[PDB]
Amino acid sequence: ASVEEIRSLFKQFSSLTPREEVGKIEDITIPGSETNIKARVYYPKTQGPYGVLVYYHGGGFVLGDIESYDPLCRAITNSCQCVTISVDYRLAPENKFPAAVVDSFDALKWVYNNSEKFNGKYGIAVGGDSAGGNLAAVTAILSKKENIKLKYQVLIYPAVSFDLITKSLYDNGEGFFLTREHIDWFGQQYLRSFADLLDFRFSPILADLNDLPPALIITAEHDPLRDQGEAYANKLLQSGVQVTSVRFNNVIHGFVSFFPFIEQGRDAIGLIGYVLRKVFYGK
Amino acid sequence: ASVEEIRSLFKQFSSLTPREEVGKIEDITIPGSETNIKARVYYPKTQGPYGVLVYYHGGGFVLGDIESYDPLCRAITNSCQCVTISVDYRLAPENKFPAAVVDSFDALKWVYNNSEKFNGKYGIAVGGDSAGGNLAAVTAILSKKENIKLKYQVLIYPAVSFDLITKSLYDNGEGFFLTREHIDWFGQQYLRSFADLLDFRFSPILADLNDLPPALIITAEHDPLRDQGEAYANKLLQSGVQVTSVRFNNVIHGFVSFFPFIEQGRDAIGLIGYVLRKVFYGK
């Protein structure tokens, strides 16, 4: 199947997943530095004012989009009781690194600067799964550099480094949905050149992690990315940042997207909702 | 440090901990088969009807009590928005196995049969930490034998087996608060003879785990009890029971009790509150 065929398939797969009702939905266009960036704003059913979570979908920098992630963003919105803004960042191979990062950061900056539009008085958080967790992490690092003050970062089974050495990569590299072959192929589509491996915007583990927002980092027992996600948590802690690092056992990469039928995914979404209600609202 | 002393010092530590307001508190005395059992009933600030969590404190079957666990049970109450009933089961070495178990089960059975006192229409769950997780697991097994239909079991870093073999026992058995030496000494206070090692009421991993209530099992990366806790989750799964097994990384045994200063502990209590709100209330 072509990359376009698989992109379409994931939208199709979404439509079989029950979409929770939220308060209100609107599509916006965010004026980016290189492009105009589509986003979907989900309001919860409760009264404002709100906290706002800017969410970056996963899909290896190549796949995924606002539509295929719509059911998960609805569930997150209701769990967190916060405005969620799901960002359609530019995809590879058509748009190589650092386009996804440029779009993701541009979107965050704009949301931070315009949070009043959403009655977003309780502050901004970032969040994302896999490649989106990478983007959330990198956006938080870029924010610190620009003195944008984030409340929280939710990193769901993130990819934080180029990896040829973690035990989990070899133990879990076959037979658990996300494989070594996939990972290598995504990396090929996204990267411009070998030199990009030195760039913290590709591997955020490389950055100085001092003064970042506190974090929830979810990993999955059977995920090749598990060890590096837990390493990002350790490096945050070593840098004085509060992080709750939680490994969901018995589940594979992607399990949160499968919340309708993997109950551990529903419970992860429950935990996400808890930490954000905590940080935004004091509960 | 005699038993009495060490009990009373833990009682002091806990006294300086700030206590969350709950809706109201009633001390009751449950007529056990062998003893009168004190229990503290915590109501949340919401109005009912409620689910009820019957909670068994940790402390190795030797330490802890209602007062020293009062701050945790308040936090849990407000998080689950459920009635929490903290049981003062008989302690060792004064009262050897199976005293704690008989009291824990007698308490559960009475709460179950009297759920209307608590406006507990949404049903009954069990929970506990460490030794208390052992008791909650054992109480669930005994319930099934007697057709008592529990909603959920929350096992917080439970001890589920006699153990000389797990990797985490050796990796984590010194220098992380709960030590080899302590685990030994607790066992020596609690058990009558070596024969009790055969008893599922001491090691619930031995039991047939079919048809038990669904479970949240929290383990801690640096706990000697970690592997056996994750084993209990796996055996539940193998036995057709739904379980969300979550390893909290970077923390030691007991971290949930130190929630006021270990934020991962507070987040664990949030997750506990989510799963119980889900199962009781559909939340």
Side-chain angles (χ1 to χ4, degrees):
Chain A
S2 77
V3 177
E4 296 290 353
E5 278 177 317
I6 300 163
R7 290 178 176 148
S8 166
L9 255 160
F10 281 101
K11 298 182 199 187
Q12 293 171 49
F13 278 141
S14 95
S15 78
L16 309 174
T17 301
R19 274 157 168 89
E20 302 185 358
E21 210 73 40
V22 297
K24 167 174 154 70
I25 294 166
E26 61 182 294
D27 288 351
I28 64 181
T29 299
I30 297 180
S33 64
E34 307 182 350
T35 196
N36 286 309
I37 299 152
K38 195 184 206 258
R40 178 162 295 157
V41 185
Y42 305 84
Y43 294 87
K45 291 176 297 206
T46 58
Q47 290 290 9
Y50 309 112
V52 184
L53 171 74
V54 187
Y55 190 80
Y56 303 103
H57 67 79
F61 305 96
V62 170
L63 307 175
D65 78 302
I66 281 166
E67 307 294 349
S68 58
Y69 271 68
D70 182 83
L72 172 64
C73 288
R74 289 163 176 269
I76 286 167
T77 296
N78 287 338
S79 178
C80 65
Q81 293 176 347
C82 78
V83 168
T84 299
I85 304 175
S86 176
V87 174
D88 238 7
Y89 55 81
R90 269 168 305 152
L91 306 168
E94 298 83 357
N95 306 276
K96 300 289 232 170
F97 173 87
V101 173
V102 171
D103 294 353
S104 300
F105 182 62
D106 284 357
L108 183 284
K109 192 167 62 249
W110 182 95
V111 170
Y112 181 80
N113 282 346
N114 290 273
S115 64
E116 297 300 337
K117 301 183 121 261
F118 313 108
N119 202 190
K121 296 197 153 58
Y122 280 103
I124 312 304
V126 286
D129 65 298
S130 198
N134 179 107
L135 293 164
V138 166
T139 295
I141 290 153
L142 294 171
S143 293
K144 143 171 101 148
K145 331 233 309 321
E146 309 266 306
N147 194 243
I148 292 175
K149 294 201 159 167
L150 301 177
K151 292 299 155 143
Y152 210 79
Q153 52 179 321
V154 182
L155 307 185
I156 312 167
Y157 29 78
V160 299
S161 191
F162 181 66
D163 184 10
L164 295 164
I165 58 178
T166 64
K167 185 63 77 174
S168 69
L169 174 72
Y170 292 85
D171 286 349
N172 297 157
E174 299 299 341
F176 299 119
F177 182 58
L178 172 66
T179 66
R180 261 307 277 282
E181 287 80 16
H182 292 152
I183 289 177
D184 290 341
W185 183 92
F186 288 129
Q188 290 191 347
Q189 308 310 308
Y190 184 50
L191 279 211
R192 279 178 314 191
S193 93
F194 211 46
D196 294 332
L197 299 190
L198 263 28
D199 192 329
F200 77 84
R201 301 175 297 161
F202 177 55
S203 294
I205 192 90
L206 300 176
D208 179 329
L209 306 185
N210 283 278
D211 304 313
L212 294 178
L216 174 67
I217 298 178
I218 288 161
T219 57
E221 178 175 6
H222 305 301
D223 183 353
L225 300 182
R226 178 197 73 200
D227 286 357
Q228 63 172 273
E230 296 176 7
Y232 199 74
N234 304 158
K235 196 172 186 271
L236 285 167
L237 293 164
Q238 284 170 350
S239 313
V241 178
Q242 186 290 140
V243 42
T244 294
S245 181
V246 302
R247 176 189 300 190
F248 281 65
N249 294 137
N250 316 114
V251 294
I252 57 163
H253 186 88
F255 77 101
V256 173
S257 283
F258 309 132
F259 67 90
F261 55 98
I262 303 301
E263 191 67 10
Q264 298 100 321
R266 172 47 77 172
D267 292 336
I269 291 170
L271 176 58
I272 299 171
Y274 173 69
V275 303
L276 289 182
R277 286 189 281 107
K278 177 187 75 175
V279 72
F280 285 146
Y281 309 123
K283 249 59 171 322
Chain B
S2 79
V3 174
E4 280 313 344
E5 252 143 54
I6 179 156
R7 279 173 185 158
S8 139
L9 265 151
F10 183 54
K11 254 153 197 144
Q12 268 160 36
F13 200 110
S14 197
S15 278
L16 274 256
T17 311
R19 280 162 168 64
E20 298 180 13
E21 202 68 20
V22 299
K24 73 152 152 170
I25 291 167
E26 301 179 358
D27 293 342
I28 71 176
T29 301
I30 291 169
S33 64
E34 296 181 354
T35 193
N36 281 348
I37 308 160
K38 195 179 193 290
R40 179 160 294 162
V41 186
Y42 301 85
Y43 292 80
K45 298 133 150 349
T46 59
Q47 81 188 87
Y50 304 117
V52 182
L53 175 65
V54 183
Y55 190 84
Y56 308 102
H57 68 80
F61 308 102
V62 173
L63 288 13
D65 81 307
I66 286 165
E67 304 290 351
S68 64
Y69 269 66
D70 186 81
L72 177 62
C73 289
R74 291 168 175 267
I76 290 173
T77 296
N78 285 337
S79 187
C80 64
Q81 279 157 2
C82 78
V83 177
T84 302
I85 300 174
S86 178
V87 176
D88 246 349
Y89 59 84
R90 275 171 294 159
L91 295 178
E94 298 88 345
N95 307 266
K96 300 231 154 219
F97 173 90
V101 172
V102 164
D103 284 359
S104 297
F105 187 51
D106 285 351
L108 175 66
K109 184 150 15 106
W110 183 92
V111 171
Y112 187 82
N113 285 328
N114 289 273
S115 62
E116 292 289 44
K117 283 185 192 275
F118 306 104
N119 203 187
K121 326 256 272 128
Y122 288 110
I124 313 299
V126 290
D129 62 297
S130 195
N134 177 104
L135 293 167
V138 172
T139 292
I141 293 155
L142 293 169
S143 289
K144 145 184 98 152
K145 327 211 108 132
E146 286 197 24
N147 257 279
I148 294 167
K149 275 162 182 76
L150 300 186
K151 293 288 188 232
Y152 208 75
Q153 56 183 317
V154 177
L155 311 181
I156 307 170
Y157 32 72
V160 303
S161 185
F162 180 66
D163 185 13
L164 297 173
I165 58 180
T166 62
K167 187 60 83 164
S168 64
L169 181 60
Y170 294 89
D171 279 350
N172 299 153
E174 303 299 329
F176 293 125
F177 178 60
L178 174 67
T179 60
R180 281 308 297 271
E181 283 73 40
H182 294 152
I183 287 164
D184 291 347
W185 182 84
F186 289 133
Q188 290 156 12
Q189 307 307 293
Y190 180 53
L191 287 194
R192 296 172 298 191
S193 74
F194 295 106
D196 291 334
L197 296 182
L198 258 8
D199 201 320
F200 76 90
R201 286 171 322 160
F202 175 60
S203 290
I205 191 89
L206 291 172
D208 191 315
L209 310 184
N210 242 83
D211 294 301
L212 295 178
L216 175 67
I217 302 181
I218 288 162
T219 52
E221 184 176 16
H222 301 309
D223 183 347
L225 303 179
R226 175 196 77 197
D227 288 356
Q228 62 171 267
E230 301 179 350
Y232 200 79
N234 288 147
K235 196 173 196 259
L236 287 167
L237 290 168
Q238 286 172 341
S239 296
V241 179
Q242 197 47 252
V243 38
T244 295
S245 174
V246 175
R247 181 196 284 193
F248 282 61
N249 293 139
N250 314 118
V251 291
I252 59 174
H253 188 79
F255 80 100
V256 172
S257 281
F258 320 132
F259 71 91
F261 33 96
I262 305 284
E263 193 67 10
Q264 300 99 316
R266 167 50 72 179
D267 291 341
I269 291 164
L271 172 61
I272 288 161
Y274 172 73
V275 302
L276 292 177
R277 286 191 284 104
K278 176 189 70 176
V279 74
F280 286 145
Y281 307 128
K283 238 51 123 56

